[PDB]
Amino acid sequence: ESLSCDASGVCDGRSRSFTSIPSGLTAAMKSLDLSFNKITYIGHGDLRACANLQVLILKSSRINTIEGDAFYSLGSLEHLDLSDNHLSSLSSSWFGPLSSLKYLNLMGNPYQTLGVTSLFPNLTNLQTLRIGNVETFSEIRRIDFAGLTSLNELEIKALSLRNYQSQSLKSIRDIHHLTLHLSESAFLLEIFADILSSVRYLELRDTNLARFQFSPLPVDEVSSPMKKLAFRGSVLTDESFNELLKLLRYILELSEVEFDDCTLNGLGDFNPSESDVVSELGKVETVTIRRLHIPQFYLFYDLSTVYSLLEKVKRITVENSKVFLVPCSFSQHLKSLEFLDLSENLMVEEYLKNSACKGAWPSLQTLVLSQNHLRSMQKTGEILLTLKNLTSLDISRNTFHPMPDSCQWPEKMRFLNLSSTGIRVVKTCIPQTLEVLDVSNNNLDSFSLFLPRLQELYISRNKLKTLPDASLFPVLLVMKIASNQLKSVPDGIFDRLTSLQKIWLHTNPWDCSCPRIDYLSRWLNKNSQKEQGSAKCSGSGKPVRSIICP
């Protein structure tokens, strides 16, 4: 029914049921959000009063027509969201005065094209521009981006693209993040050609790339600034994937590639060894795959090409893609790998054993097996001994059987993550070479392991009623024990932790009074730089920083 505006000039008119921009706008309003309304029309004078407006949010109202001079007095507007409305036609007049515009969102409107007039030439301070839609935006023309030199973000949703005019994206000098929504590989070659000098991070969404083909690009040998290339919901084939890899000859500085919810169903499988791009990841050091869907491995593949292709990569992530095995042979060829993340898969000791064979992941430093199907700490550790260079292991979120007294872990292991592992007690299975141990969110009663080199302990989210003994952590820099049900700490205890720099004590039922917690209180008070978060007293949300009894 009405506008709710604060003393900062931030006005909120969302979700009322306005059929037009309300009246009474002032010169003191800084942000006006009239989203999710029913403003079918924006006339010449509606926004004339609020000349100091910096933010105008008008998402999902039902705007279908706006007068060319509707924003004539918004010379300080920096943010304008017209997404998800009923604009069939865009008008350059809107933007003529918005010289301060940094953000503009016209995405989600049923326009077919940007119109026969460059819309953005006066937007000299523009940083984020999102345009397009799912079903009707079908053309991108050469006049479309005239005026713009550089952008942080440029998102173009054109899942219905039917015509891309060559040279359109080429006029922009610098685009840090370009997000493209393409349903087919139809104009990929030319769009790609037009951004070789400008895009540092290209992201392609929802493209069926199964019939993509490569052919040299009629361009000049120029140094491309692309560092990251990401494919979100693509459909690939073994044959098209190889066609895509040839584009790397144009992005020599590419160093990171991502594949999210992609499908890969290579049917015919390439053959011509000459038209085969191998060992061409160039300087790609990070390969990041999430939720990949392969139909079914039934026949022997080969991987000679993949061995070569992954030969110099240092970071690989294959997350939540139902992985149950990485063949030994594969692992032995990943010679430069330092980080490997198999979070959320189906690894069990039985198959890990083959995956971590003798010459497996020779340079591996960090291994993440969070959320898999591991059940035995003793076997996991034994299998991993082959990883001579391993310094950190994350086996959190695996429900392990109670650990034994004696175990064997890689010689140089300093970081061990046993968080959300379900353990009830900790035993000398955990090695003493450890500098970092996470046993948070488990079913612990106490901790009695002497770990001489422990620099950090995470024991938060457990049932410990009393702080573990301080003689167990001579060189401890960090202790986390929030959410644990501690009522008090021994007086002067922190003098005994001669290295402590950070400690988490919040979310415990501290007992505040006069004859107790006088130490904790004062210590926390004069060590605010050390306490992370804040321990509050019980029976009173008041923090444990309350002077008591003179």
Ligand X SMILES: *[C@H]1O[C@H](CO)[C@@H](O)[C@H](O)[C@H]1NC(C)=O
Ligand Y SMILES: CCCCCCC/C=C\CCCCCC(=O)O[C@H](COC(=O)CCCCCC)CO[C@H]1O[C@H](CO)[C@@H](O)[C@H](O[C@@H]2O[C@H](C)[C@H](N)[C@H](O)[C@H]2NC(C)=O)[C@H]1O
Ligand Z SMILES: *[C@@H]1O[C@H](CO)[C@@H](O[C@@H]2O[C@H](CO)[C@@H](O)[C@H](O)[C@H]2NC(C)=O)[C@H](O)[C@H]1NC(C)=O
For ligand Y, the binding residues (CB under 6 A) are 281, 287, 289, 292, 294, 296-297, 303, 306, 309-310, 318, 321-325, 330, 346
Written as six digits, the tokens of 154 are: 């440029």
What's the rounded Cα separation, in Å, for the pair 17 and 36? 8
Among 388, 412, 424, 526, binds ligand X (CB under 6 A): 388
Nearest 10 degrees: Cα torsion 276, 281, 282, 287: 180
Among 37, 73, 370, 421, binds ligand Z (CB under 6 A): 370
State in angstroms the smallest separation of the CB of 325 from ligand Y. Answer: 5
State in angstroms the smallest separation of the CB of 359 from ligand X. Answer: 8
- Closer to ligand X by CB, 115 or 362: give it: 362
What's the rounded Cα separation, in Å, for the pair 313 and 335? 8
Is position 97 an interface residue for ligand X (rule: CB under 6 A)?
A: no
3-state secondary structure 134-198: CCCCCEECCCCCCCCCEEEEEEEEECCCCEECCCCHHHCCEEEEEEEECCCCCCHHHHHHHHCCC
What's the rounded Cα separation, in Å, for the pair 15 and 60? 10
Burial of 75 (0-12, 13-18, 19+ CB in 10 A): middle
State in angstroms the smallest separation of the CB of 93 from ligand Y. Answer: 48
Report in angstroms the alpha-carbon separations of 342 from 105, 190, 315, 321: 37, 36, 11, 9
- Closer to ligand X by CB, 337 or 342: give it: 337
Is position 372 an interface residue for ligand Z (rule: CB under 6 A)?
A: no
State in angstroms the smallest separation of the CB of 364 from ligand X. Answer: 7
What's the rounded Cα separation, in Å, for the pair 59 and 36? 6
What's the rounded Cα separation, in Å, for the pair 89 and 65? 8
Count of residues that bind ligand Z according to CB under 6 A: 10
Residue 155: which of 118, 202, 115, 197 has the closest Cα? 202
| x/- map, 451-480, ligand Z, by CB under 6 A | -------x----------------------
Is position 417 an interface residue for ligand Z (rule: CB under 6 A)?
A: yes
Burial 301-328 (b: 16+ CB within 10 A, else e): eeeebebbbbebbbbbbbbebebebbeb
For residue 239, the tally of other CB atoms under 10 A from its CB is 17
Residue 254: which of 312, 213, 214, 332 has the closest Cα? 312
State in angstroms the smallest separation of the CB of 439 from ligand Z. Answer: 10
Does an H or E element contain 318, and which? Answer: strand 315-319
The three-class DSSP label of residue 337 is coil
State in angstroms the smallest separation of the CB of 366 from ligand Z. Answer: 10
Of ligand X, ligand Z, ligand Y, none, which one sits near residue 296, judging by CB under 5 to 8 A according to partner kind? ligand Y
For residue 522, what are the contacts with CB-CB under 8 A and spacing of at least 6? 547
For 502, phi then psi, to 5°, come to: -140, 140
Of ligand X, ligand Z, ligand Y, none, which one sits near residue 419, judging by CB under 5 to 8 A according to partner kind? ligand Z
State in angstroms the smallest separation of the CB of 437 from ligand Z. Answer: 9
Is position 420 an interface residue for ligand Z (rule: CB under 6 A)?
A: yes
Is position 363 an interface residue for ligand X (rule: CB under 6 A)?
A: yes
Question: Nearest 5°: CA angle at 155, between 153 and 156?
Answer: 150
Among 362, 422, 474, 543, binds ligand X (CB under 6 A): 362
Count of residues that bind ligand X according to CB under 6 A: 4
- Closer to ligand Y by CB, 328 or 472: give it: 328
Is position 396 an interface residue for ligand Z (rule: CB under 6 A)?
A: yes
- Closer to ligand X by CB, 183 or 365: give it: 365
Among 122, 128, 308, 389, binds ligand X (CB under 6 A): 389
- Closer to ligand X by CB, 90 or 337: give it: 337
State in angstroms the smallest separation of the CB of 335 from ligand X. Answer: 8
Written as six digits, the tokens of 50 are: 């609020």
How many residues can be counted in the chain?
Answer: 550
| x/- map, 424-443, ligand Z, by CB under 6 A | --------------x--x--
Of ligand Y, ligand Z, ligand X, none, which one sits near residue 394, judging by CB under 5 to 8 A according to partner kind? ligand Z
- Closer to ligand Y by CB, 194 or 319: give it: 319
State in angstroms the smallest separation of the CB of 388 from ligand X. Answer: 3
Give one DSSP letter per residue of 468-484, joined into a string: PPGGG-TT--EEE--SS
State in angstroms the smallest separation of the CB of 496 from ligand Z. Answer: 24
Interface stretch with ligand Z, choices 18-26, 416-424, 445-453, 502-510 (CB under 6 A): 416-424
State in angstroms the smallest separation of the CB of 313 from ligand Z. Answer: 22
Interface stretch with ligand Z, choices 160-168, 289-297, 413-421, 494-502 (CB under 6 A): 413-421
Burial of 137 (0-12, 13-18, 19+ CB in 10 A): buried
| x/- map, 376-395, ligand Z, by CB under 6 A | ------------------x-
| Residue corresponding to tokens 């790339």 | 209
| Residue corresponding to tokens 């505040």 | 512
Residues that bind ligand X (CB under 6 A): 362-363, 388-389
Residues at the site binding ligand Z, with contacts judged by CB under 6 A: 370, 394, 396-397, 417, 419-420, 438, 441, 458
